[PDB]
Structure formats: C-alpha cells, structure tokens
Tab-separated table of C-alpha atoms and ligand atoms in Angstrom:
chain	number	residue	atom	x	y	z
A	1	UNK	CA	31.408	-33.640	-44.016
A	2	UNK	CA	28.686	-34.426	-41.365
A	3	UNK	CA	25.551	-36.294	-42.554
A	4	UNK	CA	22.459	-37.013	-40.420
A	5	UNK	CA	19.136	-38.697	-41.364
A	6	UNK	CA	15.516	-38.990	-40.151
A	7	UNK	CA	12.874	-41.574	-41.088
A	8	UNK	CA	9.387	-40.062	-40.571
A	9	UNK	CA	6.583	-42.469	-39.565
A	10	UNK	CA	3.273	-41.991	-37.742
A	11	UNK	CA	-0.142	-43.503	-36.863
A	12	UNK	CA	-1.609	-42.649	-40.309
A	13	UNK	CA	-0.228	-42.740	-43.881
A	14	UNK	CA	2.364	-39.938	-43.656
A	15	UNK	CA	5.929	-41.145	-44.165
A	16	UNK	CA	9.166	-39.701	-45.424
A	17	UNK	CA	12.946	-39.701	-45.417
A	18	UNK	CA	14.884	-36.487	-44.656
A	19	UNK	CA	18.669	-36.078	-45.048
A	20	UNK	CA	20.849	-33.347	-43.415
A	21	UNK	CA	24.401	-32.403	-44.538
A	22	UNK	CA	26.847	-29.775	-43.118
A	23	UNK	CA	30.123	-29.261	-45.100
A	24	UNK	CA	31.741	-27.096	-42.354
A	25	UNK	CA	31.574	-26.214	-38.616
A	26	UNK	CA	28.655	-23.898	-37.648
A	27	UNK	CA	28.323	-23.835	-41.918
A	28	UNK	CA	24.770	-23.985	-43.331
A	29	UNK	CA	22.901	-27.323	-43.178
A	30	UNK	CA	21.345	-28.642	-46.413
A	31	UNK	CA	18.009	-30.452	-45.728
A	32	UNK	CA	16.491	-32.637	-48.496
A	33	UNK	CA	14.154	-35.553	-49.066
A	34	UNK	CA	10.507	-36.430	-49.605
A	35	UNK	CA	7.299	-36.852	-47.565
A	36	UNK	CA	4.133	-38.576	-48.924
A	37	UNK	CA	0.530	-39.069	-47.666
A	38	UNK	CA	-0.007	-35.294	-46.932
A	39	UNK	CA	-2.996	-33.061	-47.631
A	40	UNK	CA	-2.139	-30.471	-50.341
A	41	UNK	CA	-0.592	-27.264	-48.944
A	42	UNK	CA	1.701	-26.204	-46.075
A	43	UNK	CA	2.699	-28.508	-43.161
A	44	UNK	CA	4.692	-27.243	-40.153
A	45	UNK	CA	8.195	-28.752	-40.124
A	46	UNK	CA	10.133	-28.580	-36.832
A	47	UNK	CA	12.882	-30.118	-34.720
A	48	UNK	CA	11.299	-30.921	-31.320
A	49	UNK	CA	13.289	-31.038	-28.060
A	50	UNK	CA	13.250	-34.788	-27.186
A	51	UNK	CA	14.302	-37.787	-29.301
A	52	UNK	CA	11.580	-39.650	-27.343
A	53	UNK	CA	8.988	-41.436	-29.457
A	54	UNK	CA	7.945	-43.797	-26.505
A	55	UNK	CA	4.240	-42.964	-26.961
A	56	UNK	CA	4.576	-41.712	-30.597
A	57	UNK	CA	5.246	-38.122	-31.733
A	58	UNK	CA	3.631	-36.537	-28.599
A	59	UNK	CA	6.619	-37.779	-26.443
A	60	UNK	CA	8.973	-35.419	-28.418
A	61	UNK	CA	7.811	-32.368	-26.415
A	62	UNK	CA	7.960	-28.759	-27.656
A	63	UNK	CA	10.083	-27.118	-30.408
A	64	UNK	CA	13.841	-27.430	-29.816
A	65	UNK	CA	14.625	-24.046	-28.191
A	66	UNK	CA	18.039	-24.110	-26.429
A	67	UNK	CA	18.212	-20.217	-26.688
A	68	UNK	CA	14.726	-19.583	-25.052
A	69	UNK	CA	13.349	-17.492	-27.950
A	70	UNK	CA	9.745	-17.221	-29.251
A	71	UNK	CA	8.498	-19.176	-32.288
A	72	UNK	CA	9.147	-17.815	-35.784
A	73	UNK	CA	9.957	-18.745	-39.354
A	74	UNK	CA	13.375	-20.037	-40.472
A	75	UNK	CA	14.192	-16.617	-42.065
A	76	UNK	CA	13.432	-14.736	-38.733
A	77	UNK	CA	15.973	-13.701	-36.040
A	78	UNK	CA	13.305	-14.427	-33.368
A	79	UNK	CA	12.893	-18.211	-33.780
A	80	UNK	CA	13.398	-21.534	-32.020
A	81	UNK	CA	16.521	-23.406	-33.261
A	82	UNK	CA	14.027	-26.120	-34.396
A	83	UNK	CA	11.872	-23.732	-36.537
A	84	UNK	CA	12.230	-24.985	-40.143
A	85	UNK	CA	8.940	-23.396	-41.325
A	86	UNK	CA	6.681	-25.410	-43.676
A	87	UNK	CA	7.064	-28.128	-46.300
A	88	UNK	CA	4.490	-27.886	-49.147
A	89	UNK	CA	2.600	-30.967	-50.479
A	90	UNK	CA	1.217	-30.937	-54.011
A	91	UNK	CA	-2.058	-32.533	-55.212
A	92	UNK	CA	-0.431	-36.017	-55.126
A	93	UNK	CA	0.218	-35.475	-51.382
A	94	UNK	CA	4.003	-35.350	-51.925
A	95	UNK	CA	6.318	-32.672	-50.398
A	96	UNK	CA	9.784	-32.488	-52.015
A	97	UNK	CA	11.907	-30.924	-49.242
A	98	UNK	CA	14.851	-28.706	-50.191
A	99	UNK	CA	15.894	-26.346	-47.309
A	100	UNK	CA	19.209	-24.655	-46.397
A	101	UNK	CA	19.362	-23.397	-42.797
A	102	UNK	CA	22.122	-21.521	-40.913
A	103	UNK	CA	20.650	-21.860	-37.376
A	104	UNK	CA	20.404	-25.665	-36.957
A	105	UNK	CA	23.806	-27.438	-36.669
A	106	UNK	CA	25.176	-31.006	-36.747
A	107	UNK	CA	27.653	-30.111	-33.924
A	108	UNK	CA	27.661	-28.015	-30.718
A	109	UNK	CA	24.700	-26.597	-28.733
A	110	UNK	CA	22.623	-25.978	-31.907
A	111	UNK	CA	23.045	-29.725	-32.732
A	112	UNK	CA	19.791	-31.528	-33.740
A	113	UNK	CA	21.229	-35.113	-33.434
A	114	UNK	CA	19.167	-37.187	-30.969
A	115	UNK	CA	16.157	-34.800	-31.303
A	116	UNK	CA	12.890	-35.508	-33.201
A	117	UNK	CA	11.871	-34.115	-36.601
A	118	UNK	CA	8.054	-33.629	-36.863
A	119	UNK	CA	5.762	-32.902	-39.846
A	120	UNK	CA	2.477	-31.264	-38.672
A	121	UNK	CA	-1.237	-31.429	-39.649
A	122	UNK	CA	-1.524	-27.696	-40.490
A	123	UNK	CA	0.436	-24.696	-41.804
A	124	UNK	CA	2.929	-23.006	-39.453
A	125	UNK	CA	1.913	-19.297	-39.391
A	126	UNK	CA	5.642	-18.544	-38.655
A	127	UNK	CA	4.594	-16.581	-35.501
A	128	UNK	CA	2.512	-14.028	-37.578
A	129	UNK	CA	-0.960	-15.453	-36.776
A	130	UNK	CA	-3.694	-13.764	-34.733
A	131	UNK	CA	-3.043	-15.277	-31.214
A	132	UNK	CA	-0.694	-16.308	-28.336
A	133	UNK	CA	-0.208	-19.936	-29.628
A	134	UNK	CA	1.344	-18.364	-32.829
A	135	UNK	CA	4.613	-17.441	-30.976
A	136	UNK	CA	4.781	-20.941	-29.300
A	137	UNK	CA	3.720	-23.555	-31.917
A	138	UNK	CA	2.795	-21.468	-35.002
A	139	UNK	CA	-0.705	-23.094	-34.783
A	140	UNK	CA	0.599	-26.069	-36.898
A	141	UNK	CA	-1.621	-28.559	-34.987
A	142	UNK	CA	-1.160	-32.312	-34.535
A	143	UNK	CA	1.919	-34.433	-35.327
A	144	UNK	CA	1.410	-36.570	-38.429
A	145	UNK	CA	4.838	-38.295	-38.610
A	146	UNK	CA	8.170	-38.065	-36.790
A	147	UNK	CA	11.533	-39.745	-36.364
A	148	UNK	CA	14.626	-39.441	-34.188
A	149	UNK	CA	17.519	-37.635	-35.948
A	150	UNK	CA	20.481	-40.054	-36.302
A	151	UNK	CA	24.139	-40.084	-37.346
A	152	UNK	CA	24.607	-41.170	-41.008
A	153	UNK	CA	27.629	-42.768	-42.700
B	1	UNK	CA	21.860	-36.084	-15.050
B	2	UNK	CA	21.292	-37.307	-18.672
B	3	UNK	CA	18.401	-39.508	-19.836
B	4	UNK	CA	18.066	-41.045	-23.319
B	5	UNK	CA	15.637	-43.542	-24.773
B	6	UNK	CA	15.124	-45.976	-27.653
B	7	UNK	CA	11.934	-47.436	-29.173
B	8	UNK	CA	12.727	-50.865	-30.784
B	9	UNK	CA	10.627	-51.792	-33.890
B	10	UNK	CA	11.327	-54.079	-36.897
B	11	UNK	CA	9.902	-56.063	-39.893
B	12	UNK	CA	8.283	-58.566	-37.434
B	13	UNK	CA	6.549	-58.700	-34.005
B	14	UNK	CA	9.511	-57.755	-31.704
B	15	UNK	CA	9.030	-54.387	-29.976
B	16	UNK	CA	10.623	-52.783	-26.946
B	17	UNK	CA	11.337	-49.608	-24.990
B	18	UNK	CA	14.860	-49.114	-23.550
B	19	UNK	CA	15.811	-46.282	-21.146
B	20	UNK	CA	19.369	-45.076	-20.446
B	21	UNK	CA	20.346	-42.868	-17.464
B	22	UNK	CA	23.760	-41.410	-16.481
B	23	UNK	CA	23.752	-39.438	-13.156
B	24	UNK	CA	27.325	-38.064	-13.634
B	25	UNK	CA	29.429	-37.086	-16.702
B	26	UNK	CA	31.524	-40.142	-17.799
B	27	UNK	CA	29.927	-42.182	-14.899
B	28	UNK	CA	28.158	-45.586	-15.334
B	29	UNK	CA	24.975	-45.734	-17.473
B	30	UNK	CA	21.934	-47.615	-16.135
B	31	UNK	CA	19.980	-49.419	-18.943
B	32	UNK	CA	16.407	-50.669	-18.295
B	33	UNK	CA	13.130	-51.530	-19.987
B	34	UNK	CA	11.306	-54.354	-21.734
B	35	UNK	CA	11.273	-56.166	-25.097
B	36	UNK	CA	8.435	-58.493	-26.219
B	37	UNK	CA	7.957	-60.947	-29.118
B	38	UNK	CA	11.355	-62.712	-28.520
B	39	UNK	CA	12.231	-66.457	-28.535
B	40	UNK	CA	13.321	-67.957	-25.146
B	41	UNK	CA	17.041	-67.531	-24.472
B	42	UNK	CA	19.872	-65.089	-25.287
B	43	UNK	CA	19.448	-62.269	-27.883
B	44	UNK	CA	22.435	-60.144	-28.789
B	45	UNK	CA	21.993	-56.526	-27.712
B	46	UNK	CA	24.233	-53.898	-29.299
B	47	UNK	CA	24.655	-50.223	-30.135
B	48	UNK	CA	25.394	-50.027	-33.893
B	49	UNK	CA	27.387	-47.208	-35.520
B	50	UNK	CA	24.736	-45.300	-37.563
B	51	UNK	CA	21.360	-43.826	-36.476
B	52	UNK	CA	20.138	-44.594	-40.025
B	53	UNK	CA	16.929	-46.659	-40.389
B	54	UNK	CA	16.433	-45.707	-44.138
B	55	UNK	CA	16.139	-49.356	-45.303
B	56	UNK	CA	15.398	-50.815	-41.825
B	57	UNK	CA	17.889	-52.060	-39.201
B	58	UNK	CA	20.501	-53.059	-41.878
B	59	UNK	CA	21.194	-49.290	-42.452
B	60	UNK	CA	22.643	-49.009	-38.864
B	61	UNK	CA	25.857	-50.673	-40.073
B	62	UNK	CA	28.341	-52.526	-37.803
B	63	UNK	CA	28.650	-52.462	-33.970
B	64	UNK	CA	29.587	-48.978	-32.634
B	65	UNK	CA	33.402	-49.313	-32.422
B	66	UNK	CA	35.005	-45.849	-32.127
B	67	UNK	CA	38.301	-47.335	-30.687
B	68	UNK	CA	38.736	-50.019	-33.479
B	69	UNK	CA	38.739	-53.036	-31.077
B	70	UNK	CA	37.483	-56.628	-31.594
B	71	UNK	CA	34.011	-57.810	-30.510
B	72	UNK	CA	33.610	-58.852	-26.869
B	73	UNK	CA	31.359	-59.036	-23.843
B	74	UNK	CA	30.506	-55.917	-21.799
B	75	UNK	CA	32.838	-57.081	-18.963
B	76	UNK	CA	35.873	-57.387	-21.383
B	77	UNK	CA	38.649	-54.779	-21.868
B	78	UNK	CA	38.583	-56.060	-25.473
B	79	UNK	CA	35.118	-54.998	-26.752
B	80	UNK	CA	33.333	-52.584	-29.088
B	81	UNK	CA	31.848	-49.613	-27.165
B	82	UNK	CA	28.443	-50.851	-28.436
B	83	UNK	CA	28.865	-54.419	-26.983
B	84	UNK	CA	26.082	-54.742	-24.342
B	85	UNK	CA	26.056	-58.561	-24.487
B	86	UNK	CA	22.699	-60.404	-24.394
B	87	UNK	CA	19.165	-59.817	-23.118
B	88	UNK	CA	17.309	-63.008	-22.058
B	89	UNK	CA	13.667	-63.645	-23.013
B	90	UNK	CA	11.513	-65.820	-20.688
B	91	UNK	CA	9.331	-68.636	-22.131
B	92	UNK	CA	6.763	-65.745	-22.332
B	93	UNK	CA	9.130	-64.048	-24.878
B	94	UNK	CA	9.730	-61.017	-22.619
B	95	UNK	CA	13.230	-59.750	-21.690
B	96	UNK	CA	13.170	-57.388	-18.698
B	97	UNK	CA	16.387	-55.456	-19.436
B	98	UNK	CA	18.565	-54.389	-16.452
B	99	UNK	CA	22.210	-53.497	-17.403
B	100	UNK	CA	24.807	-51.139	-15.870
B	101	UNK	CA	27.706	-50.244	-18.209
B	102	UNK	CA	30.812	-48.004	-17.729
B	103	UNK	CA	31.956	-48.048	-21.408
B	104	UNK	CA	28.898	-46.572	-23.243
B	105	UNK	CA	28.291	-42.861	-22.365
B	106	UNK	CA	25.559	-40.241	-22.882
B	107	UNK	CA	28.206	-37.407	-22.775
B	108	UNK	CA	31.904	-36.528	-23.425
B	109	UNK	CA	32.957	-39.090	-26.068
B	110	UNK	CA	31.848	-42.768	-26.541
B	111	UNK	CA	28.389	-41.072	-26.813
B	112	UNK	CA	25.563	-43.388	-28.062
B	113	UNK	CA	23.065	-40.557	-28.806
B	114	UNK	CA	21.992	-40.612	-32.469
B	115	UNK	CA	23.203	-44.253	-32.905
B	116	UNK	CA	20.978	-47.372	-33.255
B	117	UNK	CA	20.230	-49.956	-30.540
B	118	UNK	CA	19.520	-53.447	-32.099
B	119	UNK	CA	18.220	-56.693	-30.616
B	120	UNK	CA	19.469	-59.726	-32.570
B	121	UNK	CA	18.030	-63.098	-33.695
B	122	UNK	CA	20.610	-65.298	-31.861
B	123	UNK	CA	22.827	-65.329	-28.751
B	124	UNK	CA	25.970	-63.229	-28.838
B	125	UNK	CA	29.002	-65.504	-28.030
B	126	UNK	CA	30.880	-62.407	-26.606
B	127	UNK	CA	33.754	-63.211	-29.018
B	128	UNK	CA	34.402	-66.739	-27.568
B	129	UNK	CA	32.600	-68.787	-30.358
B	130	UNK	CA	35.602	-70.284	-32.247
B	131	UNK	CA	35.151	-68.746	-35.747
B	132	UNK	CA	36.281	-65.445	-37.391
B	133	UNK	CA	32.741	-63.907	-37.184
B	134	UNK	CA	32.827	-64.334	-33.334
B	135	UNK	CA	35.427	-61.487	-33.079
B	136	UNK	CA	33.226	-59.106	-35.251
B	137	UNK	CA	29.481	-59.789	-34.678
B	138	UNK	CA	29.507	-62.552	-31.974
B	139	UNK	CA	27.404	-64.675	-34.419
B	140	UNK	CA	24.191	-62.981	-33.103
B	141	UNK	CA	22.619	-63.110	-36.610
B	142	UNK	CA	19.851	-60.894	-38.046
B	143	UNK	CA	18.307	-57.693	-36.647
B	144	UNK	CA	14.843	-58.323	-35.135
B	145	UNK	CA	14.133	-54.715	-33.981
B	146	UNK	CA	16.020	-51.409	-33.627
B	147	UNK	CA	15.615	-47.725	-32.957
B	148	UNK	CA	17.565	-44.490	-32.937
B	149	UNK	CA	18.791	-43.490	-29.489
B	150	UNK	CA	17.330	-40.077	-28.533
B	151	UNK	CA	17.519	-37.375	-25.862
B	152	UNK	CA	14.824	-37.716	-23.148
B	153	UNK	CA	13.388	-35.193	-20.681
C	1	Q85	SE1	26.127	-33.122	-32.407
C	1	Q85	C1	25.453	-34.137	-30.940
C	1	Q85	C2	24.228	-33.865	-30.359
C	1	Q85	C3	23.777	-34.649	-29.330
C	1	Q85	C4	24.552	-35.693	-28.865
C	1	Q85	C5	25.764	-35.974	-29.439
C	1	Q85	C6	26.226	-35.221	-30.506
C	1	Q85	C7	27.571	-35.470	-31.124
C	1	Q85	O1	28.280	-34.507	-31.472
C	1	Q85	N1	27.939	-36.743	-31.310
C	1	Q85	C8	29.213	-37.073	-31.937
C	1	Q85	C9	29.123	-37.287	-33.432
C	1	Q85	C10	28.217	-36.584	-34.214
C	1	Q85	C11	28.111	-36.814	-35.582
C	1	Q85	C12	28.978	-37.699	-36.206
C	1	Q85	O2	28.875	-37.888	-37.565
C	1	Q85	C13	30.044	-38.203	-38.322
C	1	Q85	C14	29.908	-38.395	-35.440
C	1	Q85	C15	29.985	-38.170	-34.072
C	2	Q85	C1	20.914	-33.668	-23.488
C	2	Q85	O1	21.923	-34.638	-23.754
C	2	Q85	C2	23.050	-34.204	-24.401
C	2	Q85	C3	24.254	-34.872	-24.227
C	2	Q85	C4	25.381	-34.425	-24.896
C	2	Q85	C5	25.337	-33.314	-25.725
C	2	Q85	C6	26.573	-32.838	-26.448
C	2	Q85	N1	27.399	-33.939	-26.939
C	2	Q85	C7	28.123	-33.826	-28.055
C	2	Q85	O2	27.947	-32.915	-28.867
C	2	Q85	C8	29.209	-34.832	-28.292
C	2	Q85	C9	30.237	-34.492	-29.178
C	2	Q85	C10	31.256	-35.371	-29.449
C	2	Q85	C11	31.287	-36.601	-28.827
C	2	Q85	C12	30.294	-36.954	-27.930
C	2	Q85	C13	29.242	-36.088	-27.655
C	2	Q85	SE1	27.886	-36.600	-26.398
C	2	Q85	C14	24.122	-32.661	-25.888
C	2	Q85	C15	22.983	-33.093	-25.229
C	3	ZN	ZN1	5.793	-28.920	-34.113
C	4	ZN	ZN1	9.005	-23.020	-32.897
C	5	ZN	ZN1	24.396	-56.366	-33.679
C	6	ZN	ZN1	30.626	-55.948	-31.068
C-alpha cells in the first residue's frame, strides 16, 4: 500500500537505491535494493534523525530515536527506531539488501519519511562491542552515502 | 516550530539550498535560501508529488496536487498545493529565494515533507499562458535541479 524510496549518494563511489513497502498500518516494512562501491563485509545501515543533507551526510545528525532508547540491532527490543543493522557487501563491492522490519513505519511517530538513510564505513556491532560508543552508534564509523527518504508512487 | 530543508542538485550546474520554517501548526511557511547556475529571469519553482529521485528529477512526477485543482500562481485560489511560482536569477545567475506561503504546510495535511522541490528551465506562466499546458505545468519546461524535502533540526 505505502511505498517510499531512497537514493544513496556520497563524496566517494558508494551509491545505491533502496525501496520500502508497507502493506498495512503499523504492518512490517519490506526493505530491498542494491548498494555498490563498498568494501567487502558488513556496513552499518541506519535511519538518521534529520532529512538534512545541506553539508552532506554529516547534516543528518544521530540515529532516528523518537523513543529515547540505546543503540541495538534490528532484532533487539533495546534499539533506536532507525537501527536496521548491517548490509553485507561481497567481493564485487555489492550489497543486495533484503530486510523486513517491524519497528520502522511509513506512517505515524515511527515514520521514516523525510529522514535520512545512511550506509556506514564499518560494521555496526549492534550495541555488543567493548565500549560506550557501542550503545550510541554501534562503532559503524563514517557516512559513505546517504539520501532523504521520499514518498513513492 | 517545524523546520525542513531541501538540497537542489541535477544533471547540470544548477545547485541550491532551500529552507522552510513554520512557527505554528497550519500557519504560513517561510521559504528562503539560494540557487546558483541559473539563467537571468524567471524559473518555475514547484513542489512535485513524489520524493523519488531514482532516475533523476523526472521520477518526482507532476506538481503536488492533493486537492485535484488546475495549475496557478501562489496567490490564486485555483492552484496546486505545490505551486510556488517563480524564483528570479540575477545576471549573476543567483536567485535569493524569499517566499511566504499559506497553502504548503510542514504539518497536518498539505504536508510537503518527503516530496520533491524542483527548479525549472523556463518561467512559470501561473496558468495564464493561453495553451492547455499552462493549466497543468505553466509551461516551465525541464527540471534543472531537485531534492527531497527533509526534516531539519
Ligand atoms: Se509518514 C510522515 C512522516 C513525516 C512527515 C509526513 C509524513 C506523512 O504521513 N505524510 C503523508 C503521506 C505519506 C505517504 C504517502 O504515500 C502514499 C502519502 C502521504
Ligand atoms: C518533525 O516534523 C514532522 C512533521 C510532521 C510529522 C507527522 N506528519 C504526518 O505524519 C502527516 C500525515 C498525513 C498528512 C500530513 C502529515 Se505532515 C512528523 C514530523
Ligand atoms: Zn549511522
Ligand atoms: Zn542506533
Ligand atoms: Zn515543475
Ligand atoms: Zn502546478
């Protein structure tokens, strides 16, 4: 029923297209698409609070966290609304994204429309790493590509 | 309150930053910022329906028109919600944008968040141009630059 889309671009080679679809109110959201130009392995994959790309991906601010929780993985109760874990790039540098999530929404206060989707330099340790930054950012490092999340036809 | 923002980019040299602010729910929206790389004169300036940049600015679809009206100027009863008229570039190719509008909103309904702002090749005739296209697009021609309208801090 509701479809939303994000074009990921950055200052380097990373680029992608991510689609979101929600068949019903407060239903699960299907997330799918492709990202290229990545180093092989895990890359943190988050909805950030601001749809502000004025000075590139840094303008997007922290993880989208309307419920003031700590950082976690998508399968954790203790998570930011924006915590979609990691996407995994193969040896060609391509991540084929296929996620279903029950916490993000395309309506209401969990809505991600008008926020920024970010793919990160490093793996998200899903809040299980050895330090304080783990339960804020997951230690996923710099922002390789981002886009504002928009309404699709 | 509410603040939202749009980074305009395209297939060419036009680029801009547009800020929106609404102090009160369903109150007027102040629009301000700057666009560079333009030809001297009028350039149509519209909110388009979809926040979809998948294949560039064409993916944004038609003017944002939730009430199914004909194309007009921002001061007309008879307008699309997305009809913000023209920005004017100086001989230096810079439009300093300064608009106040009571039809677009950042809340309630008529909300432009997650839609696309587009600056056009030609002047918008505000529906007064004397052909059929005037009452749909205002004959403002191709899409020089666009961006998805996002939530700001
Ligand atoms: Se959801 C959300 C989040 C932030 C700002 C606005 C909205 C919203 O609900 N906008 C209305 C809307 C959303 C999606 C679609 O897609 C068919 C249409 C209208
Ligand atoms: C921080 O800015 C925000 C402004 C508005 C909202 C919530 N708005 C909506 O879901 C909505 C739904 C239907 C029609 C119009 C709108 Se604006 C969230 C954040
Ligand atoms: Zn992040
Ligand atoms: Zn987080
Ligand atoms: Zn237009
Ligand atoms: Zn129009």
